[PDB]
Amino acid sequence: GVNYQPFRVVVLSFELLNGPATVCGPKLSTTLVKDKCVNFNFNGLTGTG
Amino acid sequence: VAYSNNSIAIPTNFTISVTTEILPVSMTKTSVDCTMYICGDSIECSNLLL
Ligand SMILES: *[C@@H]1O[C@H](CO)[C@@H](O[C@@H]2O[C@H](CO)[C@@H](O)[C@H](O)[C@H]2NC(C)=O)[C@H](O)[C@H]1NC(C)=O
């Protein structure tokens, strides 16, 4: 029966913003803009500054 | 004090004294931007604050 059928389980444990990240989602990088008010996405951190 | 029914003390000299009294008149006037303090310039925030 399905209840007794084998199930493969993978558990992913991770921290996101804190610490340097070598693993990232598939977003293309854009040229850095400075001295202007811009929305920024540094390593998954989003803010306007 | 030495007190007597027939005794009085009268000053034969005087002293001029200057003293300083300090009273606060005003306090700093302050204004607060409610959205800037709570939302921190976040576009997503302030929709809830409406
Ligand atoms: C009242 O007090 C003043 C001083 O507080 C006396 O004036 C002094 O007189 C002496 C001489 O006796 C001087 O050496 C001092 O220099 C004086 N002081 C000042 C500030 O001028 C004054 O003589 C006193 N009056 C009485 C009635 O005794």
Side-chain angles (χ1 to χ4, degrees), chain B residues 1-48:
Chain B
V1 181
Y3 170 75
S4 172
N5 57 4
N6 47 22
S7 177
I8 195 184
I10 304 219
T12 69
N13 218 4
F14 57 76
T15 299
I16 294 233
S17 173
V18 173
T19 56
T20 67
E21 177 171 356
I22 312 165
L23 293 170
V25 170
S26 58
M27 51 181 278
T28 76
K29 320 182 310 182
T30 57
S31 54
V32 170
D33 192 11
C34 205
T35 172
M36 207 168 188
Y37 179 88
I38 305 178
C39 295
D41 208 7
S42 167
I43 315 295
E44 296 83 9
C45 187
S46 188
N47 309 343
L48 297 97

Side-chain angles (χ1 to χ4, degrees), chain A residues 37 39 48, chain B residues 40-41 43:
Chain A
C37 179
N39 303 358
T48 302
Chain B
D41 208 7
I43 315 295

Side-chain angles (χ1 to χ4, degrees), chain A residues 24-32 39-44:
Chain A
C24 278
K27 293 190 64 63
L28 52 135
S29 297
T30 78
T31 65
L32 186 60
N39 303 358
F40 54 78
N41 195 357
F42 281 75
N43 289 347

Side-chain angles (χ1 to χ4, degrees), chain A residues 5-26:
Chain A
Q5 272 175 7
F7 268 62
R8 279 179 174 184
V9 179
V10 161
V11 179
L12 301 170
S13 52
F14 41 74
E15 42 175 355
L16 312 106
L17 323 147
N18 45 348
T22 57
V23 167
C24 278

